[PDB]
Nucleic acid binder design. Structure first.
Ligand SMILES: Nc1ncnc2c1ncn2[C@@H]1O[C@H](COP(=O)(O)OP(=O)(O)O)[C@@H](O)[C@H]1O
Lengths: 580, 88, 100, 100, 111, 111, 97, 99, 81
DNA sequence: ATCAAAACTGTGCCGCAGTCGGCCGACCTGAGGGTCGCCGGGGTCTGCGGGGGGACCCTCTGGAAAGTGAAGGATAAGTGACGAGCGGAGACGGGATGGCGAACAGACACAAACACACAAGAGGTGAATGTTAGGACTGTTGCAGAT
DNA sequence: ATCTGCAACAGTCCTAACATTCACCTCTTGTGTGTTTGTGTCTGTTCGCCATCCCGTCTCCGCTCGTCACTTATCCTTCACTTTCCAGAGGGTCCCCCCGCAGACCCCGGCGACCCTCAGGTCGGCCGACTGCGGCACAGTTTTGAT
């Protein structure tokens, strides 16, 4: 039991923030309770839970802690943040110096909200040329400013500018880049200057790794270093199925809730707006083929059991063959692609089974990816069979990026399968007009979930979202899936923690904690190719059922040749044991 | 469809015309013909081939896969091209 | 000559004459060309063993083995000479080790 | 103010003075690294490098190309010219020993 | 006891592996000297000597001679490109040069 | 009882390089079988002379350039301006060094 | 991890520098260059004295072989002064202690 | 008889015969007096083995033949036929021996 | 022994140039090649007399010339070792 | 033979890596003190071969004279490299995400050095034994230079 | 198209430079058995590099184009080079002398290798930390390109 010891830490050094200009104690020792907004907030009303979060953060200011707003996508962090800014401007009369930090893909939107909702506060931006930066440099060295927008990058690139000013209150956004304790931006913010009041803002909990520590337990509070430098793994000791994780460390999980009481706020999207209907998630099992089978399972033997770090290449053997392009010089060296040469990957056979019926039934489709060469060769097929599409990646040059949404959100947008990348876009897609979001390869994260779903899960998703998370039989893609999904739904505990770390229904912290521990104890239950089932898990209603059976009749009266290619022969011996 | 990797600027021609001109104007040259570029690029290619095959041989003898500073310095030392600075 | 022990100095001369009678059954060699082949054999010996000495001190061994002489071959000899020299050396050391 | 263009040669001479006056690296690091890794891929397919290995190769190759252009400048000036051509890069390497 | 097996006879060579082993032993190259290393080195040396003598004997065949002279070794060496690369800084005594004339110095074909 | 474990062999000859380390490197470097007791003193004094000559000539190159810290450009200028140091380091490329301010006489236009 | 001592002539180059220029410091990479220079000339003089030992059919590297190695390696005036420095120090070493 | 060859014919036939032959080309006794003078600069009472003098002669004549090959290349490069002191200096500078 | 360098006769230098492949020679080659030959012999003979003065002999030998040539860079085959 | 137009060059200030001085940790290497194989060095002898002188003989250098043919200077048509401007664009920072390989510490059987025994292979001589390149001595065609 | 002059072949001819035996001496290399230490094997830690993508921020590289200083082809003159011949002279060869001297033994002490302690000089992270120094900023020469 060390929660009271950290309470003693904060009780001892809770006086620094008020001299230098129990946890139920530290969040409730001072109170001021005004549900009314500050007077100069213009351009729309507040929701009541927005006022709740605002009042909580005003108490965070008055408890003089370092708070965290961490609710879900599409629930208004921006208006709450500028409401905090204007309440702290007028109703406390300290008038800055305020700093903010956003990603550059949202700085126009944040400056728009700074114009519409606080015209009394003058807002300096930082973008563009060194000419514009030099003009605003000469403007800011005198001290005539209220709000200083800047990105991630100009913190280090204007070190001297934003260090010679004694800062008061920064509020930085998108904290899952602020996570890394050896990020150079994090080192410059820590050895920057003693800026007083700092807030992370995020839409996600801990991801990718171990619990929350390296962002919120470390950067947001410096005294937790002095109280954590040996006990970090001691709290992280929960990190095999019933006895350790479920039975005896349920108290440890409750102690993690108990230490993360006064600092977070993750109100779920299901509570108040709930305009997202649902998320109909299924999984679909692809397989190998005549090269990806014992042909390439020979190459696991005659390579290891050559290319370096084959775990990366074992993704490529189950995504698509001849992305190496050396075996294209043996299977189709005539450099002309056709039927049953591109199609030989089993994922791709599943594509040209499933895609013509959603072409018929009219499902608008987003498709995400890693490995942009898979996007390229899918685009090569997508010009081969000639069905309509687009493509977006890390080579859109920001103008076609801001352009392409008008092409895809037309009422006559005949382009249907909008090819994407899982990384590409940076929370700026804003696309409600799809109803089928398939996924090729699972990442090393649930950020693929928590972004690529939310691209279509925005305000205005007026269908049911049918997700087809592909997988292949006994490849590395399954250990990617079970690895990331199981041991990175650690935040099943934290997504349960959201409601009683929010508005706090009192039965959430025991009863529905157990009801989601049900999903954490159906591990072995959940761990353990037919047109009927696969065509129903995409189906929605019965006219779709009649036309999918009609398309089955229409490709059954046509005599399908066969499914795909068989194992031709001498090139199978040639690709493996004659390379070198 | 550009699906091959045939369409990309090749890596030896990535040693640019203005970088060849900066090594020339450091060398002392006042005026440079137009075939110097191909010739100097061929010269650099052959010299790197000699030094990197010696460094690969030293590395493979030491039974590792990481070509190091001392391996390149020993290779230049037996090229006759002795280098100070990196071999302590 | 009255007995004063003409001092023995060794060479490679009978061995070069053996190899010449292998690769050409009917050709004599001159005395000065015998001395050139002798100085050549000493030169190539001293180059290869000097490079194996440097590899021994680099890798902090203290022992010249078949692998250090193989790597000295791959350093000193060019191209196809290095290839056939490595082939001859490995053939002779396996015929040494296996047979007796 | 547009008709102020220097006599051809003058910018070349101030380039000569600045680049001999300074001591940085002149070929840029990323494409020279990709060239080094390509040429190494022609020998051992699965290598790894080091930042100091690539910087050692870059110091060596830039000092080599500067010495080659000093000697080719001497050969071009000997031929009563100013413009260096390929025939005297080949002459500098033939005389120096690196060609034949 | 056996009668005798020379180590050269075991390996099938011609050069003296015993003499090679004592030269590697006390030429101060390293302290310990392995037991397969003189066999490998004598093999390398027998190869290089056989190569040189084969090319010199072919040149002496070409000049109707049956005695191999330093001119013949010079011609073999500087006419084989790889032996020329190995023996680049080497003056074979009583050599002469390769018989070579430049192409400018030939007389005018029209006159 | 040890008499007086002091006065390292560097201190007896009055040198500034380690005679002990030089003797150990000559001894286990396997240059020869055995090493006299005066040869590393002689060698260490020689290496003191050479380091002293280059560092003096580089001190007088980091005075013209108004700079009290010897960077490699200064070692390049000292070495390649002393003609005997240039002949000792003739094949050597001092890294991060740069070349000398040499512009040929026929290049710079004056007439 | 038992931090491995990799030794060099850094502090000795520094002593000589503070003798001949008392108010000058040396950069880090120039110290690496002076280190590599001392190791280079060490290997050359020791290699030539080893060659002299094998050429005379004699087993011992002595001061005579180091003196002839210095006269065979160094140019001219550097050779004459370095041989003078070495003989100076060897007579001071043999006479005093 | 006016049977005088034009220059070029006798030059090419001396090229042919002196590349086909193999003997030494500097006279043995004046070369020996040269060597003994130069060595008399360095030591007073030396004695020369005849193989030492002939080794010096082989080395010097292979040196001068290789140097004149590089001077012939430089002279052809300068659009000439005549070798000159400026290109002897050129090959001894590009090679390394002088500067 | 006064000015023995002119014992290198003018047709001797012309013969070495004919072996070298020189078709036509200047008239100032002669003093220049005598200077070149004298520099090369001063270097080789300085190194070989250093080997001999070390060996406590009073005789230049074939091995001393060979060792001087080898440490200069010019290896010489045919005079023993 | 004077002024516009750029380009270095001082000064000077201001943060920033980065020398650098202790701090002692904390060793791991050098100094000292003993022992004892062993190698180098002083000393004698003795063939041996390099310096030197001289006789003779002849090929090879020195020197001059005549023709001439490349070296070099002047000239002009031709074109290719250089300076400058402008707009994409790839180097360059920084990040995400695992994963592996190399440097660094104990235990240990191959393996290489030691050291005797001994014979047999390899130098030194010699002596026919040929023999094979070398050296004049002439027959005989292929390149060269006015016809 | 025909004299003509070196130069490559065609077949003897002393001689000398290798190649066979030969016994033979000796030293040197296998053969075989105690033995010890250098090299490898696996277990754990840490940190830097690899295969993939991202996301900005820029100097800087590529392309166009105008314009002219260069490279090169032609021609003319002229002097420095080759070719030939011919008188002489030193280089080459033989031979003889004749002592300095290189090398081989011989013997005996100094001396360096090895070993065993044991104190402290050297590395080396921290711990600031002082400052020497690059990067902006502002006046002020200082050459170049017209004129
Ligand atoms: N009281 C309100 N009335 C209308 N719209 C609101 C209100 N509060 C918030 N919003 C909406 O919230 C949006 C901003 O939300 P944002 O901060 O982007 O949420 P998230 O950060 O979760 O994506 C605005 O576009 C605005 O339309």
């Amino acid at each position: 039991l060390l929660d009271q010891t950290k309470d003693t830490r904060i009780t001892h050094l809770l006086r620094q923030t008020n001299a230098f200009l129990d946890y139920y104690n530290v969040a409730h020792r001072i109170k001021e309770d005004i549900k009314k907004q500050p007077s100069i907030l213009v351009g729309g009303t507040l929701k009541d839970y927005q006022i709740k979060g605002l009042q909580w953060m005003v108490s965070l200011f008055n408890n003089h802690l370092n708070g965290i707003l961490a609710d879900e996508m599409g629930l208004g962090k921006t208006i709450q943040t500028i409401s905090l800014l204007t309440y702290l401007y007028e109703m406390k009369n300290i008038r800055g110096p305020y700093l903010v930090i956003v990603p550059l893909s949202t700085l126009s939107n944040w400056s728009s909200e700074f114009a519409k909702w606080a015209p009394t506060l003058r807002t300096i931006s930082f973008k563009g040329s060194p000419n514009e930066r030099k003009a605003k440099q000469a403007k800011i060295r005198a001290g005539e400013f209220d709000v200083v927008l800047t990105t991630f990058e100009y913190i280090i690139k204007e070190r001297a500018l934003l260090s010679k000013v004694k800062w008061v209150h920064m509020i930085i956004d998108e904290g899952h880049r602020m996570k890394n304790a050896q990020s150079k931006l994090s080192l410059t913010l820590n050895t920057h200057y003693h800026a007083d009041y700092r807030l992370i803002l995020t839409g996600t909990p801990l991801q990718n790794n171990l619990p929350e520590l390296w962002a919120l337990l470390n950067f947001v509070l410096p005294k937790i270093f002095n109280s954590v430098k040996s006990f970090d793994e001691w709290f992280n000791t929960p990190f095999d199925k019933i006895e350790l994780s479920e039975e005896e460390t349920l108290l440890v999980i409750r102690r993690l809730h108990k230490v993360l009481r006064p600092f977070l706020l993750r109100r779920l999207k299901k509570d108040v707006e709930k305009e997202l209907p649902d998320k109909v998630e299924k999984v679909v099992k692809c397989k190998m083929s005549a090269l990806q089978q014992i042909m390439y399972q020979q190459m696991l033997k005659y390579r290891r059991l050559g290319f370096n770090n084959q775990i990366m290449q074992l993704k490529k053997i189950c995504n698509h063959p001849f992305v190496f392009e050396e075996v294209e010089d043996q299977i189709n060296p005539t450099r002309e692609t056709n039927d049953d040469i591109w199609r030989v990957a089993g994922k791709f056979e599943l594509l040209d089974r499933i895609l013509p019926k959603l072409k018929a039934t009219g499902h608008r489709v987003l498709i995400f990816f890693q490995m942009t060469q898979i996007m390229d060769i899918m685009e090569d097929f997508l010009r081969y069979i000639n069905i309509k599409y687009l493509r977006l990646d890390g080579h859109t040059k920001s103008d076609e990026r801001s352009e392409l949404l008008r092409l895809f959100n037309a009422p006559d947008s005949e382009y249907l399968c909008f090819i994407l990348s899982t990384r590409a876009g940076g929370l700026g897609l804003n696309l409600q007009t799809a109803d089928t979001v398939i996924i090729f390869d699972t990442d090393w994260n649930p950020h693929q979930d928590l972004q690529a779903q939310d691209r279509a899960h925005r305000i205005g998703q007026k269908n049911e979202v049918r997700i087809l998370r592909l997988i292949t039989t006994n490849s590395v893609e399954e250990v990617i899936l079970e690895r990331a999904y199981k041991k990175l739904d650690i935040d099943g505990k934290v997504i349960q923690a959201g409601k009683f770390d929010n508005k706090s229904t009192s039965e959430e912290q025991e009863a529905l904690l157990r009801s989601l521990l049900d999903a954490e104890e159906e591990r072995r239950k959940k761990r353990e190719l037919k047109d009927s089932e696969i065509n129903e898990i995409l189906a929605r209603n019965d006219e779709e059922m009649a036309v999918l059976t009609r398309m089955d009749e229409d490709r059954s009266k046509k005599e399908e040749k066969s499914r795909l290619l068989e194992k031709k022969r001498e090139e199978s011996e040639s690709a493996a044991v004659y390379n070198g | 469809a550009k699906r091959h990797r045939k369409v990309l600027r090749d890596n030896i021609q990535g040693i640019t015309k203005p970088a060849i001109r900066r090594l020339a104007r450091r060398g002392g040259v006042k005026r440079i013909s137009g075939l110097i570029y191909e010739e100097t690029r061929g010269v650099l290619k052959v010299f790197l081939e000699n030094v990197i095959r010696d460094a690969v041989t030293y590395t493979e003898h030491a039974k590792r896969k990481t070509v190091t500073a001392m391996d390149v310095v020993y290779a230049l030392k037996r090229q006759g091209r002795t280098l100070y600075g990196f071999g302590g | 000559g009255k007995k004063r022990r003409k001092t023995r100095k060794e060479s490679y001369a009978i061995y070069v004459y053996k190899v010449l009678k292998q690769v050409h059954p009917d050709t004599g060699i001159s005395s000065k060309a015998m001395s050139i082949m002798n100085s050549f054999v000493n030169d190539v010996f001293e180059r290869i063993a000097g490079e194996a000495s440097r590899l021994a001190h680099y890798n902090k061994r203290s022992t010249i083995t078949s692998r250090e002489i193989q790597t000295a071959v791959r350093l000193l000899l060019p191209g196809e000479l290095a290839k056939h020299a490595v082939s001859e050396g490995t053939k002779a050391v396996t015929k040494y080790t296996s047979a007796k | 103010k547009k008709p102020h263009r220097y006599r051809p040669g003058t910018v070349a001479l101030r380039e000569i003075r600045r680049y001999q006056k300074s001591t940085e690296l002149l070929i840029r690091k990323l494409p020279f690294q990709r060239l080094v890794r390509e040429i190494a891929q022609d020998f051992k397919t699965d290598l790894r490098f080091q930042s100091s290995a690539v910087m050692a190769l870059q110091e060596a190759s830039e000092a080599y190309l500067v010495a080659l252009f000093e000697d080719t400048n001497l050969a071009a000036i000997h031929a009563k010219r100013v413009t260096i051509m390929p025939k005297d890069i080949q002459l500098a390497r033939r005389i120096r020993g690196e060609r034949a | 006891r056996a009668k005798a097996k020379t180590r050269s006879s075991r390996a099938g060579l011609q050069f003296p592996v015993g003499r090679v082993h004592r030269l590697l032993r006390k030429g101060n190259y390293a302290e310990r000297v392995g037991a397969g290393a003189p066999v490998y080195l004598a093999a390398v040396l027998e190869y290089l000597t056989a190569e040189i003598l084969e090319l010199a004997g072919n040149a002496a065949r070409d000049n109707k001679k049956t005695r191999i002279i330093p001119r013949h070794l010079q011609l073999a060496v500087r006419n084989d490109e790889e032996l020329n690369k190995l023996l680049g800084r080497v003056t074979i005594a009583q050599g002469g040069v390769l018989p070579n004339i430049q192409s400018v110095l030939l007389p005018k074909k029209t006159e």
